[PDB]
Amino acid sequence: EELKEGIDAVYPSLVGTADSKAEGIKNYFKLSFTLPEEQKSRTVGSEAPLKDVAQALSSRARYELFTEKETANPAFNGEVIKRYKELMEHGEGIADILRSRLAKFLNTKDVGKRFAQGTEANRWVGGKLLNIVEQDGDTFKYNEQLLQTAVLAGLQWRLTATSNTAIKDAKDVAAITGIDQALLPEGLVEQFDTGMTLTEAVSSLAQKIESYWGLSRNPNAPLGYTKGIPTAMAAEILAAFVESTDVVENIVDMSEIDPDNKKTIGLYTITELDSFDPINSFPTAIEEAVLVNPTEKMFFGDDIPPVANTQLRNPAVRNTPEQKAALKAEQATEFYVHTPMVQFYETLGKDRILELMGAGTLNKELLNDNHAKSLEGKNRSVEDSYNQLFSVIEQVRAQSEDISTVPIHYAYNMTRVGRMQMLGKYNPQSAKLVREAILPTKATLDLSNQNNEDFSAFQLGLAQALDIKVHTMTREVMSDELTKLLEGNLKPAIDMMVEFNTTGSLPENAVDVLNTALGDRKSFVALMALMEYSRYLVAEDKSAFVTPLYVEADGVTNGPINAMMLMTGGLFTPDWIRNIAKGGLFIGSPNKTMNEHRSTADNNDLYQASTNALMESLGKLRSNYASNMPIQSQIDSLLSLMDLFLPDINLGENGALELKRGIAKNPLTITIYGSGARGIAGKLVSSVTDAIYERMSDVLKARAKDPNISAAMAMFGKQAASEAHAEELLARFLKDMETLTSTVPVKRKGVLELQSTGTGAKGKINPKTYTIKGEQLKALQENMLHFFVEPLRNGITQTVGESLVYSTEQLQKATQIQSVVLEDMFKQRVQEKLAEKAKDPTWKKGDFLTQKELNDIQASLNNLAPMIETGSQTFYIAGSENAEVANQVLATNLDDRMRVPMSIYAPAQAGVAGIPFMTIGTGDGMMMQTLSTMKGAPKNTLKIFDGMNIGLNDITDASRKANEAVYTSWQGNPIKNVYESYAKFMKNVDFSKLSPEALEAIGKSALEYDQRENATVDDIANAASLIERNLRNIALGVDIRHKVLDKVNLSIDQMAAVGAPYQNNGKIDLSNMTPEQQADELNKLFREELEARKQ
DNA sequence: TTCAAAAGAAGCGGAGCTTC
Ligand SMILES: Nc1nc2c(ncn2[C@@H]2O[C@H](COP(=O)(O)O)[C@@H](OP(=O)(O)OC[C@H]3O[C@@H](n4cnc5c(N)ncnc54)[C@H](O)[C@@H]3O)[C@H]2O)c(=O)[nH]1
Ligand SMILES: [Mn+2]
């Protein structure tokens, strides 16, 4: 009751009665919200928020008074104050648009007159804003406090939303657009990553608006109003921004991108401010005024980010104590601007940085259309990073006279998969350009003697930055390779940088000099290396040289290796010992390092081993079809085409096939994580078509530079030796493209057969519009699938071990089955409650359920063990936010458009998510979390998931701790964790209660293709409990292996580069033994440990 | 079926079916 009259005192004039049982118009704003116990927003109570905040922003003194702080961010100066004054005036224009739009709505279809007569329009999907209007003579008007506060939220969102949007990948776009991921057109993914979907824009706006309103949700009010009213407000604000042209709306017709797709999709992009707009130096003034506890802000000095209580976008999952400890540790690290790189970036200038690191200026007619779109996407990313960096620098520069002395902190959160992610799009963790200007690494080195350990550290940092693969060679060999480079190709660049570090000037051909010197080594960190070595050369005191140059301790094929260690469940095999050594687990070799292994024992890493296995599987494939000439020809053409355009595939003069580890890197990784072969085939083809489109721009360029040039020379000039030698390359290309688009392999009854597509590639090539589309793309993909990817998959399995593949399958099925039941039961418990609501006369279809009701439903699922617990991490595989549960609109704008589906936090099918969740989570996730919290945890590093940047002073000890953290994570047992959860599930699940849809989904996972079709609940049930037994057995094995492995002498250098391996000090000595001998000895220990328990 | 975040628009009518 105190709450009712409390919220009424604040909004006494809103239309309707604050009682859900009342007969006439009811006010769902006061029913849905209460005043907080403690102030959240300084606009609560204000009769004119826009006037008050504008006043607050009008001077430093007034701002300080308003926020009740004694001092304001020094970035808030005259120039910035003047810009905010102009932005407040614009807030008035947004407010004015909103008021007119309301008046239009009230007048159309006499909604206002009807509402006044008792028609409950304030409950319509388009009428929820009527809960915040006030009667005004013969009509209605917005409550000014609520209206103007939402506008302030709208201005803040307008300033910073773009910079906080999620990144879209091909997967996201395919889901959005309904177009198969493998067939997405060029630049479509780019078009979609640039804008916001309606849901994306509205939900971020709504969150901000509700935040500024500064109220609390009533647990017993229907979500249709608690979420609905601020969403209706957001929708209206987005619409006003479209009217004001602060936001551009683009309705994308899928019909032209695919004749059969009927979706039309809205894209919303915020009009960018000028890069030199003063407000960029301090874009959060409003947020920091309105909110008592601002979320959008920079953390300078000893202003430390708070620790997140719950997993990112998974509010049902609390960050564990150990996770919070890790977050705290990472949020405490101080970052500092490295002034020389900033000055270098600035002196080069945005345009030359793009020429150097992007695609420079685009001549949209020396470029193939499709290529042109990738180039644009490239520039976008570098340009945004540049602009974002310098906005941050502008704000840092205000904090002090020496920007290199201003400490900077970053907020972090744990993601769904256990990774510690730095919040924001453009920060050191996520943006390479920013990574080289803002660093937590720093050291003072004695470089007066090139025989110091300090100089050796310095060399290692330069080499790694320069794309020398420092983990494949010893420190000594590295040193000689680096010296060769600095005295050879890099010298002209080094000389230029010496000059720059002397006078502060660059030549006009700087881009050329860098580009030529670096060649393929070019990167932002390479620039840091040139900068730092040249700074050392001109340094006055080489004996105390200060530098943020770092060495990254980086995982060697980290995910696959972790999966092999964590989820291989059988006896030990020699192949496993050899392969796992490729990832830094050395048995019976005290103090062995990855550098030594690679140089003296085995130069092939796990990607190369898989690639070599691929070549065998391919050789086998060729045999089974040896007499079938058309099939041999089809394979040769695929191999030929890839050879023309991909560096990783080489065909020799006499036909010798050679493959670089590169083509196996991504396919190995994602295959373990549950990717299908088709998806991989599609990716390989993309890399082929990308290269082709690019070669077409080469044609246009060479052809324009010389109209005489022959087609062959224009397309294979750079790639060939002679004229006629380029004429055969052209012949291969045209033959390959034709056979690969007109003929596809299919698998009928275990055998491959060629079929005509009837849609072969035909016609003269026009290098500008040339596009491999639809039916042609699919054909290329089918060829790639059967003649390359399928043998690759065979190679992968032989490499990582069939035992691991088996474990990931049981893990996948268990977590899928569980997610299906969870999803289905949730939806059912929801439909039950809504049927109870039709009995309620206070309730209307569209109101949905209360939070309290949703909470009770979620709690009722606890006996199905939705959460996986390791003791230090919590995983919620099924957790999601979906439109499928409520299946209805939440709100629209006042024009009956911008219809936002009602989204609910609820479990959904996992699919294959179980694998990467557990592998990433208990692998690199657990390693980094351990690294942050362990005794003697390395200080002043930047952690990037499976690699860690270390200052040059501490590379040895930090690397050793990193490898100890790896070993610690290898004591994990993610299958055991899944088993514990799945066995509780199996004890409580009622398969008979599931919908038939749920039931068949489970059949797919638990039952062979055959026994499905028409199996009973009991067949499903019995099959589901077999998986539990499988899990139990795997988990037992994993546990034994780990204990046995711990008894033996191990050297671990998975976090490689520095050559500082962790020794487990196992007492049983397996040195001077072959992998076969070692496997036998480990299997004895395994059997003996299996008996300790059996008895 | 790789993971790390979801996600059509809009007339009529007042939800939800319909057509593009
Ligand atoms: N889950 C995931 N992680 C990704 C993906 N792309 C990149 N990452 C992570 O970021 C670094 C690279 O950051 P950068 O700014 O230096 O480029 C990357 O390191 P690695 O390339 O060495 O891979 C380490 C482990 O990450 C997982 N992983 C990589 N790539 C993928 C993909 N495509 N899909 C799933 N998982 C991936 C593996 O466990 C790998 O061993 C990553 O740490 C990304 O798309 N997804
Ligand atoms: Mn790595």
mmCIF file with all atom_site columns, N, CA and C in Angstrom, chain A residues 823-864:
data_model
loop_
_atom_site.group_PDB
_atom_site.id
_atom_site.type_symbol
_atom_site.label_atom_id
_atom_site.label_alt_id
_atom_site.label_comp_id
_atom_site.label_asym_id
_atom_site.label_entity_id
_atom_site.label_seq_id
_atom_site.pdbx_PDB_ins_code
_atom_site.Cartn_x
_atom_site.Cartn_y
_atom_site.Cartn_z
_atom_site.occupancy
_atom_site.B_iso_or_equiv
_atom_site.pdbx_formal_charge
_atom_site.auth_seq_id
_atom_site.auth_comp_id
_atom_site.auth_asym_id
_atom_site.auth_atom_id
_atom_site.pdbx_PDB_model_num
ATOM 1   N N  . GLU A 1 823 ? 13.200  -26.810 -22.639 1.00 0.00 ? 823 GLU A N  1
ATOM 2   C CA . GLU A 1 823 ? 12.451  -25.894 -23.474 1.00 0.00 ? 823 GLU A CA 1
ATOM 3   C C  . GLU A 1 823 ? 10.973  -26.282 -23.494 1.00 0.00 ? 823 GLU A C  1
ATOM 4   N N  . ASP A 1 824 ? 10.693  -27.556 -23.744 1.00 0.00 ? 824 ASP A N  1
ATOM 5   C CA . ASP A 1 824 ? 9.310   -27.998 -23.900 1.00 0.00 ? 824 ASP A CA 1
ATOM 6   C C  . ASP A 1 824 ? 8.479   -27.840 -22.621 1.00 0.00 ? 824 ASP A C  1
ATOM 7   N N  . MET A 1 825 ? 9.065   -28.195 -21.483 1.00 0.00 ? 825 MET A N  1
ATOM 8   C CA . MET A 1 825 ? 8.364   -28.105 -20.206 1.00 0.00 ? 825 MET A CA 1
ATOM 9   C C  . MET A 1 825 ? 8.099   -26.660 -19.844 1.00 0.00 ? 825 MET A C  1
ATOM 10  N N  . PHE A 1 826 ? 9.051   -25.795 -20.168 1.00 0.00 ? 826 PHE A N  1
ATOM 11  C CA . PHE A 1 826 ? 8.876   -24.386 -19.901 1.00 0.00 ? 826 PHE A CA 1
ATOM 12  C C  . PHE A 1 826 ? 7.682   -23.864 -20.698 1.00 0.00 ? 826 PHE A C  1
ATOM 13  N N  . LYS A 1 827 ? 7.661   -24.145 -21.996 1.00 0.00 ? 827 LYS A N  1
ATOM 14  C CA . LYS A 1 827 ? 6.566   -23.674 -22.836 1.00 0.00 ? 827 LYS A CA 1
ATOM 15  C C  . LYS A 1 827 ? 5.226   -24.203 -22.340 1.00 0.00 ? 827 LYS A C  1
ATOM 16  N N  . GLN A 1 828 ? 5.201   -25.460 -21.900 1.00 0.00 ? 828 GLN A N  1
ATOM 17  C CA . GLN A 1 828 ? 3.970   -26.054 -21.375 1.00 0.00 ? 828 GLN A CA 1
ATOM 18  C C  . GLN A 1 828 ? 3.509   -25.382 -20.091 1.00 0.00 ? 828 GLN A C  1
ATOM 19  N N  . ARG A 1 829 ? 4.406   -25.258 -19.118 1.00 0.00 ? 829 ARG A N  1
ATOM 20  C CA . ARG A 1 829 ? 4.077   -24.572 -17.876 1.00 0.00 ? 829 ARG A CA 1
ATOM 21  C C  . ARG A 1 829 ? 3.594   -23.150 -18.167 1.00 0.00 ? 829 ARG A C  1
ATOM 22  N N  . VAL A 1 830 ? 4.097   -22.549 -19.247 1.00 0.00 ? 830 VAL A N  1
ATOM 23  C CA . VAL A 1 830 ? 3.603   -21.237 -19.662 1.00 0.00 ? 830 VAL A CA 1
ATOM 24  C C  . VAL A 1 830 ? 2.171   -21.295 -20.217 1.00 0.00 ? 830 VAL A C  1
ATOM 25  N N  . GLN A 1 831 ? 1.887   -22.258 -21.092 1.00 0.00 ? 831 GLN A N  1
ATOM 26  C CA . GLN A 1 831 ? 0.538   -22.390 -21.661 1.00 0.00 ? 831 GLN A CA 1
ATOM 27  C C  . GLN A 1 831 ? -0.506  -22.742 -20.601 1.00 0.00 ? 831 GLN A C  1
ATOM 28  N N  . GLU A 1 832 ? -0.081  -23.472 -19.577 1.00 0.00 ? 832 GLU A N  1
ATOM 29  C CA . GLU A 1 832 ? -0.959  -23.808 -18.462 1.00 0.00 ? 832 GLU A CA 1
ATOM 30  C C  . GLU A 1 832 ? -1.375  -22.550 -17.706 1.00 0.00 ? 832 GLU A C  1
ATOM 31  N N  . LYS A 1 833 ? -0.403  -21.692 -17.406 1.00 0.00 ? 833 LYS A N  1
ATOM 32  C CA . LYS A 1 833 ? -0.659  -20.467 -16.654 1.00 0.00 ? 833 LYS A CA 1
ATOM 33  C C  . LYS A 1 833 ? -1.524  -19.479 -17.428 1.00 0.00 ? 833 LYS A C  1
ATOM 34  N N  . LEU A 1 834 ? -1.339  -19.426 -18.743 1.00 0.00 ? 834 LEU A N  1
ATOM 35  C CA . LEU A 1 834 ? -2.154  -18.558 -19.589 1.00 0.00 ? 834 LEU A CA 1
ATOM 36  C C  . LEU A 1 834 ? -3.607  -19.046 -19.707 1.00 0.00 ? 834 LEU A C  1
ATOM 37  N N  . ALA A 1 835 ? -3.819  -20.356 -19.615 1.00 0.00 ? 835 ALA A N  1
ATOM 38  C CA . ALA A 1 835 ? -5.175  -20.894 -19.597 1.00 0.00 ? 835 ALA A CA 1
ATOM 39  C C  . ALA A 1 835 ? -5.860  -20.562 -18.270 1.00 0.00 ? 835 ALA A C  1
ATOM 40  N N  . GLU A 1 836 ? -5.080  -20.487 -17.194 1.00 0.00 ? 836 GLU A N  1
ATOM 41  C CA . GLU A 1 836 ? -5.600  -20.025 -15.909 1.00 0.00 ? 836 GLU A CA 1
ATOM 42  C C  . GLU A 1 836 ? -5.961  -18.542 -15.950 1.00 0.00 ? 836 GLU A C  1
ATOM 43  N N  . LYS A 1 837 ? -5.331  -17.803 -16.857 1.00 0.00 ? 837 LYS A N  1
ATOM 44  C CA . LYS A 1 837 ? -5.525  -16.356 -16.941 1.00 0.00 ? 837 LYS A CA 1
ATOM 45  C C  . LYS A 1 837 ? -6.822  -15.984 -17.642 1.00 0.00 ? 837 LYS A C  1
ATOM 46  N N  . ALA A 1 838 ? -7.303  -16.862 -18.515 1.00 0.00 ? 838 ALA A N  1
ATOM 47  C CA . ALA A 1 838 ? -8.576  -16.632 -19.187 1.00 0.00 ? 838 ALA A CA 1
ATOM 48  C C  . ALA A 1 838 ? -9.733  -16.679 -18.188 1.00 0.00 ? 838 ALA A C  1
ATOM 49  N N  . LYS A 1 839 ? -9.489  -17.273 -17.022 1.00 0.00 ? 839 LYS A N  1
ATOM 50  C CA . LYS A 1 839 ? -10.476 -17.291 -15.946 1.00 0.00 ? 839 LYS A CA 1
ATOM 51  C C  . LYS A 1 839 ? -10.513 -15.927 -15.271 1.00 0.00 ? 839 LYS A C  1
ATOM 52  N N  . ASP A 1 840 ? -9.396  -15.213 -15.342 1.00 0.00 ? 840 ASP A N  1
ATOM 53  C CA . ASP A 1 840 ? -9.255  -13.932 -14.663 1.00 0.00 ? 840 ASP A CA 1
ATOM 54  C C  . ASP A 1 840 ? -9.825  -12.799 -15.508 1.00 0.00 ? 840 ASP A C  1
ATOM 55  N N  . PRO A 1 841 ? -10.833 -12.097 -14.974 1.00 0.00 ? 841 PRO A N  1
ATOM 56  C CA . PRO A 1 841 ? -11.455 -10.958 -15.653 1.00 0.00 ? 841 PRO A CA 1
ATOM 57  C C  . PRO A 1 841 ? -10.580 -9.696  -15.659 1.00 0.00 ? 841 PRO A C  1
ATOM 58  N N  . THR A 1 842 ? -9.583  -9.622  -14.781 1.00 0.00 ? 842 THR A N  1
ATOM 59  C CA . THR A 1 842 ? -8.663  -8.486  -14.775 1.00 0.00 ? 842 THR A CA 1
ATOM 60  C C  . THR A 1 842 ? -7.608  -8.626  -15.871 1.00 0.00 ? 842 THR A C  1
ATOM 61  N N  . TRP A 1 843 ? -7.513  -9.821  -16.439 1.00 0.00 ? 843 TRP A N  1
ATOM 62  C CA . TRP A 1 843 ? -6.436  -10.142 -17.360 1.00 0.00 ? 843 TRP A CA 1
ATOM 63  C C  . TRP A 1 843 ? -6.913  -10.105 -18.798 1.00 0.00 ? 843 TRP A C  1
ATOM 64  N N  . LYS A 1 844 ? -6.049  -9.637  -19.684 1.00 0.00 ? 844 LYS A N  1
ATOM 65  C CA . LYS A 1 844 ? -6.387  -9.550  -21.091 1.00 0.00 ? 844 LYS A CA 1
ATOM 66  C C  . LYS A 1 844 ? -5.295  -10.213 -21.918 1.00 0.00 ? 844 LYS A C  1
ATOM 67  N N  . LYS A 1 845 ? -5.695  -10.912 -22.970 1.00 0.00 ? 845 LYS A N  1
ATOM 68  C CA . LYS A 1 845 ? -4.742  -11.530 -23.876 1.00 0.00 ? 845 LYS A CA 1
ATOM 69  C C  . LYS A 1 845 ? -3.810  -10.447 -24.404 1.00 0.00 ? 845 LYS A C  1
ATOM 70  N N  . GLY A 1 846 ? -2.512  -10.642 -24.196 1.00 0.00 ? 846 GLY A N  1
ATOM 71  C CA . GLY A 1 846 ? -1.517  -9.656  -24.567 1.00 0.00 ? 846 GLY A CA 1
ATOM 72  C C  . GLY A 1 846 ? -0.749  -9.176  -23.351 1.00 0.00 ? 846 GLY A C  1
ATOM 73  N N  . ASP A 1 847 ? -1.374  -9.283  -22.177 1.00 0.00 ? 847 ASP A N  1
ATOM 74  C CA . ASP A 1 847 ? -0.733  -8.922  -20.914 1.00 0.00 ? 847 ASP A CA 1
ATOM 75  C C  . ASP A 1 847 ? 0.403   -9.883  -20.543 1.00 0.00 ? 847 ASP A C  1
ATOM 76  N N  . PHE A 1 848 ? 0.274   -11.136 -20.972 1.00 0.00 ? 848 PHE A N  1
ATOM 77  C CA . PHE A 1 848 ? 1.233   -12.196 -20.641 1.00 0.00 ? 848 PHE A CA 1
ATOM 78  C C  . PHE A 1 848 ? 1.286   -12.481 -19.135 1.00 0.00 ? 848 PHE A C  1
ATOM 79  N N  . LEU A 1 849 ? 2.419   -12.992 -18.666 1.00 0.00 ? 849 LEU A N  1
ATOM 80  C CA . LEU A 1 849 ? 2.570   -13.408 -17.274 1.00 0.00 ? 849 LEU A CA 1
ATOM 81  C C  . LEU A 1 849 ? 3.384   -12.391 -16.501 1.00 0.00 ? 849 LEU A C  1
ATOM 82  N N  . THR A 1 850 ? 3.374   -12.509 -15.177 1.00 0.00 ? 850 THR A N  1
ATOM 83  C CA . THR A 1 850 ? 4.191   -11.644 -14.326 1.00 0.00 ? 850 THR A CA 1
ATOM 84  C C  . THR A 1 850 ? 5.607   -12.209 -14.170 1.00 0.00 ? 850 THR A C  1
ATOM 85  N N  . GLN A 1 851 ? 6.534   -11.409 -13.654 1.00 0.00 ? 851 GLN A N  1
ATOM 86  C CA . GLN A 1 851 ? 7.878   -11.935 -13.434 1.00 0.00 ? 851 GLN A CA 1
ATOM 87  C C  . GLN A 1 851 ? 7.818   -13.046 -12.396 1.00 0.00 ? 851 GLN A C  1
ATOM 88  N N  . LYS A 1 852 ? 7.051   -12.803 -11.344 1.00 0.00 ? 852 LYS A N  1
ATOM 89  C CA . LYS A 1 852 ? 6.857   -13.779 -10.285 1.00 0.00 ? 852 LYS A CA 1
ATOM 90  C C  . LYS A 1 852 ? 6.394   -15.119 -10.857 1.00 0.00 ? 852 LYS A C  1
ATOM 91  N N  . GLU A 1 853 ? 5.481   -15.080 -11.819 1.00 0.00 ? 853 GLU A N  1
ATOM 92  C CA . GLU A 1 853 ? 4.992   -16.300 -12.445 1.00 0.00 ? 853 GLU A CA 1
ATOM 93  C C  . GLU A 1 853 ? 6.074   -16.972 -13.291 1.00 0.00 ? 853 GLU A C  1
ATOM 94  N N  . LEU A 1 854 ? 6.805   -16.180 -14.068 1.00 0.00 ? 854 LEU A N  1
ATOM 95  C CA . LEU A 1 854 ? 7.884   -16.727 -14.879 1.00 0.00 ? 854 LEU A CA 1
ATOM 96  C C  . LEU A 1 854 ? 8.971   -17.334 -13.991 1.00 0.00 ? 854 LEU A C  1
ATOM 97  N N  . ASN A 1 855 ? 9.283   -16.648 -12.890 1.00 0.00 ? 855 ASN A N  1
ATOM 98  C CA . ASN A 1 855 ? 10.220  -17.132 -11.875 1.00 0.00 ? 855 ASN A CA 1
ATOM 99  C C  . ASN A 1 855 ? 9.813   -18.474 -11.290 1.00 0.00 ? 855 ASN A C  1
ATOM 100 N N  . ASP A 1 856 ? 8.521   -18.636 -11.021 1.00 0.00 ? 856 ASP A N  1
ATOM 101 C CA . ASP A 1 856 ? 8.033   -19.885 -10.451 1.00 0.00 ? 856 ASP A CA 1
ATOM 102 C C  . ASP A 1 856 ? 8.169   -21.016 -11.467 1.00 0.00 ? 856 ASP A C  1
ATOM 103 N N  . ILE A 1 857 ? 7.938   -20.698 -12.738 1.00 0.00 ? 857 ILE A N  1
ATOM 104 C CA . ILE A 1 857 ? 8.061   -21.696 -13.792 1.00 0.00 ? 857 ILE A CA 1
ATOM 105 C C  . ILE A 1 857 ? 9.511   -22.131 -13.935 1.00 0.00 ? 857 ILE A C  1
ATOM 106 N N  . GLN A 1 858 ? 10.419  -21.160 -13.907 1.00 0.00 ? 858 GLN A N  1
ATOM 107 C CA . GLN A 1 858 ? 11.851  -21.431 -14.009 1.00 0.00 ? 858 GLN A CA 1
ATOM 108 C C  . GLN A 1 858 ? 12.327  -22.272 -12.833 1.00 0.00 ? 858 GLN A C  1
ATOM 109 N N  . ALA A 1 859 ? 11.808  -21.971 -11.647 1.00 0.00 ? 859 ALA A N  1
ATOM 110 C CA . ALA A 1 859 ? 12.193  -22.697 -10.444 1.00 0.00 ? 859 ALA A CA 1
ATOM 111 C C  . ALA A 1 859 ? 11.679  -24.130 -10.471 1.00 0.00 ? 859 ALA A C  1
ATOM 112 N N  . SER A 1 860 ? 10.544  -24.339 -11.135 1.00 0.00 ? 860 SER A N  1
ATOM 113 C CA . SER A 1 860 ? 9.948   -25.662 -11.226 1.00 0.00 ? 860 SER A CA 1
ATOM 114 C C  . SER A 1 860 ? 10.768  -26.612 -12.102 1.00 0.00 ? 860 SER A C  1
ATOM 115 N N  . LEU A 1 861 ? 11.788  -26.075 -12.768 1.00 0.00 ? 861 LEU A N  1
ATOM 116 C CA . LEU A 1 861 ? 12.628  -26.869 -13.660 1.00 0.00 ? 861 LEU A CA 1
ATOM 117 C C  . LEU A 1 861 ? 13.949  -27.239 -12.998 1.00 0.00 ? 861 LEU A C  1
ATOM 118 N N  . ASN A 1 862 ? 14.158  -26.759 -11.779 1.00 0.00 ? 862 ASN A N  1
ATOM 119 C CA . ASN A 1 862 ? 15.420  -26.996 -11.090 1.00 0.00 ? 862 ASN A CA 1
ATOM 120 C C  . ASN A 1 862 ? 15.764  -28.464 -10.882 1.00 0.00 ? 862 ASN A C  1
ATOM 121 N N  . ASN A 1 863 ? 14.751  -29.311 -10.769 1.00 0.00 ? 863 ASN A N  1
ATOM 122 C CA . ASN A 1 863 ? 15.011  -30.728 -10.545 1.00 0.00 ? 863 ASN A CA 1
ATOM 123 C C  . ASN A 1 863 ? 15.440  -31.441 -11.826 1.00 0.00 ? 863 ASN A C  1
ATOM 124 N N  . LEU A 1 864 ? 15.501  -30.695 -12.927 1.00 0.00 ? 864 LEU A N  1
ATOM 125 C CA . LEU A 1 864 ? 16.027  -31.220 -14.184 1.00 0.00 ? 864 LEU A CA 1
ATOM 126 C C  . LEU A 1 864 ? 17.457  -30.727 -14.412 1.00 0.00 ? 864 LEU A C  1
#
